[PDB]
Amino acid sequence: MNHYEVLVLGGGSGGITMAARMKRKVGAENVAIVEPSERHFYQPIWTLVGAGAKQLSSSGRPTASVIPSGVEWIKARVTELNPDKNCIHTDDDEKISYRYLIIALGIQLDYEKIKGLPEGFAHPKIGSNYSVKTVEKTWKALQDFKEGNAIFTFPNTPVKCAGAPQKIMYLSEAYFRKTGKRSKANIIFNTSLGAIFGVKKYADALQEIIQERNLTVNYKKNLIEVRADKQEAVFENLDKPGETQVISYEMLHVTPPMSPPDVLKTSPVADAAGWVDVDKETLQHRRYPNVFGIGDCTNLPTSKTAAAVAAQSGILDRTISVIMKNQTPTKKYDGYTSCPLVTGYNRVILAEFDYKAEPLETFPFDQSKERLSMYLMKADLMPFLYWNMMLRGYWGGPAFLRKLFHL
Amino acid sequence: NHYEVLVLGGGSGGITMAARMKRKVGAENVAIVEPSERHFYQPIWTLVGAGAKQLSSSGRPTASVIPSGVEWIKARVTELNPDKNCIHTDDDEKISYRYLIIALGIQLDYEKIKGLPEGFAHPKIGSNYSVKTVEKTWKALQDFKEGNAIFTFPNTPVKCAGAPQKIMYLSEAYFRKTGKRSKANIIFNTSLGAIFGVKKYADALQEIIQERNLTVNYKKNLIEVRADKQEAVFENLDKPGETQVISYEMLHVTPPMSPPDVLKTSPVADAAGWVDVDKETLQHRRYPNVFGIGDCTNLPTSKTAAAVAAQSGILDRTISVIMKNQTPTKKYDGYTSCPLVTGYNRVILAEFDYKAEPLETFPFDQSKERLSMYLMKADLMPFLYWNMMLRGYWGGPAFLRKLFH
Numbered sequence: 001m002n003h004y005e006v007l008v009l010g011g012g013s014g015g016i017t018m019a020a021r022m023k024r025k026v027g028a029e030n031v032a033i034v035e036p037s038e039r040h041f042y043q044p045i046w047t048l049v050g051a052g053a054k055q056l057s058s059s060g061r062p063t064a065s066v067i068p069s070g071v072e073w074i075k076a077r078v079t080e081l082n083p084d085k086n087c088i089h090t091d092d093d094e095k096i097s098y099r100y101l102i103i104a105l106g107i108q109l110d111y112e113k114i115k116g117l118p119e120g121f122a123h124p125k126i127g128s129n130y131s132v133k134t135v136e137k138t139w140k141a142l143q144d145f146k147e148g149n150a151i152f153t154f155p156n157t158p159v160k161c162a163g164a165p166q167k168i169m170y171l172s173e174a175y176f177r178k179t180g181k182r183s184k185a186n187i188i189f190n191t192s193l194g195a196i197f198g199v200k201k202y203a204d205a206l207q208e209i210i211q212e213r214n215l216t217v218n219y220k221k222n223l224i225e226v227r228a229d230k231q232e233a234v235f236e237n238l239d240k241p242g243e244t245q246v247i248s249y250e251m252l253h254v255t256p257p258m259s260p261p262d263v264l265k266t267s268p269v270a271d272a273a274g275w276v277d278v279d280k281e282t283l284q285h286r287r288y289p290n291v292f293g294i295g296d297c298t299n300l301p302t303s304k305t306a307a308a309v310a311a312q313s314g315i316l317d318r319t320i321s322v323i324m325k326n327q328t329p330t331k332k333y334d335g336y337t338s339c340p341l342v343t344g345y346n347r348v349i350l351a352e353f354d355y356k357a358e359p360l361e362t363f364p365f366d367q368s369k370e371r372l373s374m375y376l377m378k379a380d381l382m383p384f385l386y387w388n389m390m391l392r393g394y395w396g397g398p399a400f401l402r403k404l405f406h407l
Numbered sequence: 408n409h410y411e412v413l414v415l416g417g418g419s420g421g422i423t424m425a426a427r428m429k430r431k432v433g434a435e436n437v438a439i440v441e442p443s444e445r446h447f448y449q450p451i452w453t454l455v456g457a458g459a460k461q462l463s464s465s466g467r468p469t470a471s472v473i474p475s476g477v478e479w480i481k482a483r484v485t486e487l488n489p490d491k492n493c494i495h496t497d498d499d500e501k502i503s504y505r506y507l508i509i510a511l512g513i514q515l516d517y518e519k520i521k522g523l524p525e526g527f528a529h530p531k532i533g534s535n536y537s538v539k540t541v542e543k544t545w546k547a548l549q550d551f552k553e554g555n556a557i558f559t560f561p562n563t564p565v566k567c568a569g570a571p572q573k574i575m576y577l578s579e580a581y582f583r584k585t586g587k588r589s590k591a592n593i594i595f596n597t598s599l600g601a602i603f604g605v606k607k608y609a610d611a612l613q614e615i616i617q618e619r620n621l622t623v624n625y626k627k628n629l630i631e632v633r634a635d636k637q638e639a640v641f642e643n644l645d646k647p648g649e650t651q652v653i654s655y656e657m658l659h660v661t662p663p664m665s666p667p668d669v670l671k672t673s674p675v676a677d678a679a680g681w682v683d684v685d686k687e688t689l690q691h692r693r694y695p696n697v698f699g700i701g702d703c704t705n706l707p708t709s710k711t712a713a714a715v716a717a718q719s720g721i722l723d724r725t726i727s728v729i730m731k732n733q734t735p736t737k738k739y740d741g742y743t744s745c746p747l748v749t750g751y752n753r754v755i756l757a758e759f760d761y762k763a764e765p766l767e768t769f770p771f772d773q774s775k776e777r778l779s780m781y782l783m784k785a786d787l788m789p790f791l792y793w794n795m796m797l798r799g800y801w802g803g804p805a806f807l808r809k810l811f812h
């Protein structure tokens with residue numbers, strides 16, 4: 001069997017980041033990354049791509065260009081995990097064994113669980129910022145919008161970046177005002193959830209925006225079907241089972257249902273729900289002491305964000321080094337996550353919070369305010385630091401900045 | 408091989424539907440895929456675990472309940488390919504169908520609790536949810552001398568949501584009738600925030616809880632069993648990272664549960680892995696010749712055999728009218744029932760619908776503890792199950808409810 005001291009499953013934000021940190025610890029020849037995609041995406045910018053403010057081409061780089069040099073890139077899909085034998089299977093009919101496994105397989109998008117998708121995306125007026133194949137269709141629908149309902153959905157599943165489904169609603173609202181057709185747009189957010197956001201400080205701030213800008217939110221309302229040829233969408237009422245509503249749209253942004261990656265769903269490393277079953281504080285697997293998880297694929301009970309990945313990557317770096325010494329981990333993940341809620345083409349409400357779902361803001365000022373500074377950070381500083389700092393293992397989230405500020 | 412109606416699963420829903428479908432398309436045109444040699448009436452495991460009934464009586468040979476003339480394919484489903492109207496099995500065969508009824512149940516996941524199932528080889532721990540462990544509930548109940556008696560509820564969907572606490576009420580009663588009640592600290596450690604989802608019955612259980620000095624600890628989920636040390640580890644779901652290690656003298660484990668593995672990644676499932684069916688007709692949302700019944704579906708009601716019975720009458724009509732090129736009209740209302748055993752001779756018969764509101768069959772108050780309902784649960788229901796429901800003649804008690812009203 002081909003063998004690596006440290007085997008990383010997934011070449012996304014978590015997997016590249018952990019690979020760069022592990023390269024420094026065990027040497028690059030002792031690390032391998034399993035990743036099928038030729039391309040690596042900074043997904044946060046898709047929100048601005050869907051709104052016409054950033055180019056899709058700049059959101060991605062070749063996977064080979066972010067593989068830390070000297071690390072082995074195994075271009076394949078993981079098909080099975082056998083942690084009892086310290087090995088995995090890939091779709092090139094090979095088995096790979098490891099001394100330590102880092103699972104960073106992300107979250108899976110399930111558009112086809114919505115009847116009529118993804119085939120409906122072949123028609124006009126419907127987009128989705130969650131897919132490289134559909135984010136530019138969001139922007140086209142926004143551009144070609146003339147009159148009617150502009151509908152934004154939120155599924156009945158876990159999601160990555162819980163705020164992105166409404167960010168693009170605020171961007172669309174601003175676009176209608178900028179282009180003089182706000183009065184022709186009836187803007188509807190149909191969310192499966194019961195609240196606009198999970199942290200009260202920012203939910204309150206978004207609700208004031210919902211009122212001022214005349215937006216409709218229908219709660220516990222889940223998209224179950226698109227008829228793209230007819231510009232109709234069907235929403236089930238999760239409160240009254242069986243009752244469904246058909247409604248026409250001039251623009252539909254679909255947030256797809258999401259789930260653990262198919263290979264993890266049935267795997268021994270998953271919990272009963274299919275997520276990688278890790279310690280909430282150290283990110284070491286609950287049952288396989290040489291396995292670890294980071295990012296969207298884990299059952300860490302916090303928002304699934306790249307910012308959470310960065311904070312986790314700092315903890316997991318420490319966890320692995322002390323597991324390598326047969327010592328007991330002491331540094332603990334606090335659940336840090338961040339959600340830069342884009343509310344317009346030049347404003348962000350920078351939500352930051354931890355496992356307690358309470359504000360944990362980095363800067364000395366009140367981040368529940370719409371801020372230009374926070375927009376420029378999200379739109380222009382964050383991509384640069386992602387490619388040149390986080391992916392190279394030099395970003396563990398802003399806790400040090402927060403402590404350095406409150407000083 | 409090809410069948411007009413292929414049924415996946417020979418449990419409560421699949422047998423019931425195969426019998427109903429035999430009478431529509433001919434026995435020679437129905438097949439059941441099912442690996443187990445034994446078919447169990449699971450509701451009685453609650454009483455086996457309390458020592459009130461025998462395990463042997465709860466199972467019969469699967470061949471015994473297969474409708475005569477219906478092909479029993481003794482195998483496991485391993486893939487569903489609804490776009491080609493076929494499934495695959497673990498003896499490497501392809502079976503095609505005109506109509507497909509999915510009744511694969513719910514899957515028990517004991518091994519997601521660290522220390523299980525190997526911890527069951529030690530004394531003082533049982534689980535009514537498995538044929539391999541329900542008699543160990545009863546052994547644990549009998550050998551209990553003094554300490555904590557712990558009853559758990561996982562952080563997943565479950566079948567028979569009431570059974571995790573039914574066995575606590577029975578154990579409480581068993582402790583009094585054998586003198587050691589004062590020696591037992593009885594606690595219910597549940598992942599949920601309420602004792603039951605339907606307010607009428609929740610309130611009735613709440614006073615039983617108060618009056619019998621039971622402790623309910625909300626948002627506490629069992630994550631590890633240290634069986635040789637008699638310790639149970641709970642995570643606090645309100646404070647991520649916080650745990651509690653508790654000693655037990657008896658532990659009853661309600662396992663984490665999930666959709667059957669073959670359904671998790673299948674095209675017929677929704678994003679969560681449940682069979683994705685229309686909430687009123689039980690026809691699949693995306694494959695019009697696919698249908699689902701029972702625990703494996705995403706029908707947003709309590710997962711019970713009583714729900715299966717009510718679903719089987721609706722599913723029966725849905726498929727018949729579809730075969731006749733008509734649009735289904737009769738709607739499932741979410742009917743389910745929970746016969747909450749509260750002692751060795753009482754039952755609180757909870758009945759409710761999609762609205763989580765009481766929908767009681769009988770004209771008296773079912774939120775009271777009743778011996779009639781106990782005797783119905785313990786003696787009438789199993790007779791009705793083997794000889795009426797499994798033969799396709801029980802679609803739930805809606806007609807009785809109207810009679811008595």
Ligand SMILES: Cc1cc2nc3c(=O)[nH]c(=O)nc-3n(C[C@H](O)[C@H](O)[C@H](O)COP(=O)(O)OP(=O)(O)OC[C@H]3O[C@@H](n4cnc5c(N)ncnc54)[C@H](O)[C@@H]3O)c2cc1C
Pocket residue numbers: 009010011012013014015034035036037042043044045046047076077078079104105106107129130131160161164261263294295296297304305306307308309338339340
């Ligand atoms: C529209 C949008 C906006 C967002 N905005 C923000 C934001 O403002 N801030 C923020 O912090 N986060 C944001 N995010 C979230 C951020 O993109 C993710 O949380 C982050 O990428 C998670 O990293 P990950 O490593 O867990 O997964 P990913 O980066 O998604 O990588 C997972 C990798 O696993 C690979 N993989 C999958 N299955 C297999 C398999 N079987 N075998 C091998 N490899 C496999 C995939 O190819 C992928 O490369 C946004 C996301 C979206 C979609």
Ligand SMILES: Cc1cc2nc3c(=O)[nH]c(=O)nc-3n(C[C@H](O)[C@H](O)[C@H](O)COP(=O)(O)OP(=O)(O)OC[C@H]3O[C@@H](n4cnc5c(N)ncnc54)[C@H](O)[C@@H]3O)c2cc1C
Pocket residue numbers: 415416417418419420421440441442443448449450451452453482483484485510511512513535536537566567570667669700701702703710711712713714715744745746
């Ligand atoms: C302890 C306990 C007490 C209960 N008490 C009550 C009660 O009082 N009242 C009530 O209404 N309900 C009660 N129930 C619930 C009741 O048992 C179930 O809701 C009912 O059995 C559901 O029927 P089903 O057909 O969906 O699943 P099951 O009856 O479990 O049948 C599923 C079948 O699928 C088969 N199968 C699984 N995977 C595959 C595969 N890959 N290929 C082929 N076949 C497969 C299994 O072998 C099994 O035979 C109780 C359950 C338990 C565990």
Ligand SMILES: COC1=C(OC)C(=O)C(CC=C(C)C)=C(C)C1=O
Pocket residue numbers: 196207210211214215216217218219
């Ligand atoms: C239920 O969703 C909605 C709200 O709550 C988030 C609103 O506040 C508003 C504006 C509300 C008030 C009370 C002025 C609308 C129109 C709405 O649809």
Ligand SMILES: COC1=C(OC)C(=O)C(CC=C(C)C)=C(C)C1=O
Pocket residue numbers: 044306307308310338339340362382383385386390395397398
């Ligand atoms: C792009 O993903 C993100 C991060 O990872 C690179 C962050 O660290 C952070 C937090 C950084 C600061 C300066 C608060 C945010 C907000 C974010 O969106």
Ligand SMILES: COC1=C(OC)C(=O)C(CC=C(C)C)=C(C)C1=O
Pocket residue numbers: 450712713716744745746768788789791792796801803804
């Ligand atoms: C055994 O499973 C059960 C049924 O299916 C056979 C029921 O119909 C019913 C409802 C039947 C009546 C007469 C209320 C209950 C309570 C039940 O537990």
Ligand SMILES: *[C-]#N*
Pocket residue numbers: 160161162163164303305338339340
């Ligand atoms: C939040 N994203």
Ligand SMILES: *[C-]#N*
Pocket residue numbers: 566567568569570709711744745746
């Ligand atoms: C409820 N059973």
